[PDB]
Write a protein that binds this ligand. Sequence first.
Ligand SMILES: NCCc1c[nH]cn1
Length: 144
Amino acid sequence: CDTVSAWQSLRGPGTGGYYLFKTTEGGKTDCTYVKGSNFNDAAQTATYTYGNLGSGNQLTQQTASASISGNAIVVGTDHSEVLYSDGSTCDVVRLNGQIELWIHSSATSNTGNLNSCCTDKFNQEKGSRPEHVVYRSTCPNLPQ
Ligand SMILES: NCCc1c[nH]cn1
C-alpha cells in the first residue's frame, strides 16, 4: 500500500473534490468537504474551497491557498500529514492529532467498498478511538 505524495493527494484526479467520511474528531459538522482548483503542478499550490453544511441545505464556502510542506497538505495553519492516499479516491490524513478518512466525490456511492489501503490505514491509525461518520448521501453536491 505505497502512498502517493502529498501533492498527488491534494490534486487527486484534478476534478471533483473530497468529503470527510470518517474521523476521530467529535462535533464535526456534517458534509465537511474540500475541493481543489487552479492547480499549479510546478509550485505545488492550489486554491482550496472548503466548508460544511450551513443553513438552507447549502454548503458553506471559504477559499484559501493550499500548498505542500514536507508530507503535509497545508491550508492556513492546518498541516494535514498524508498517512495514505491513492491520489484518486481517498486519503487518510492526520491533523491536530485526529485521524481523518476523506473520499472523492466519485466514491460517495460506494463507501463500503473503498480502497483497502485507505480503510486499513484509517483502522490501524485510529487505535482505540471511537470513529465518527461525517458524510451522508443527502449532503449537497460540491461547489461547481
Ligand atoms: N485529497 C486531499 C483531501 C484533504 C484532506 N485534508 C486536506 N485535503
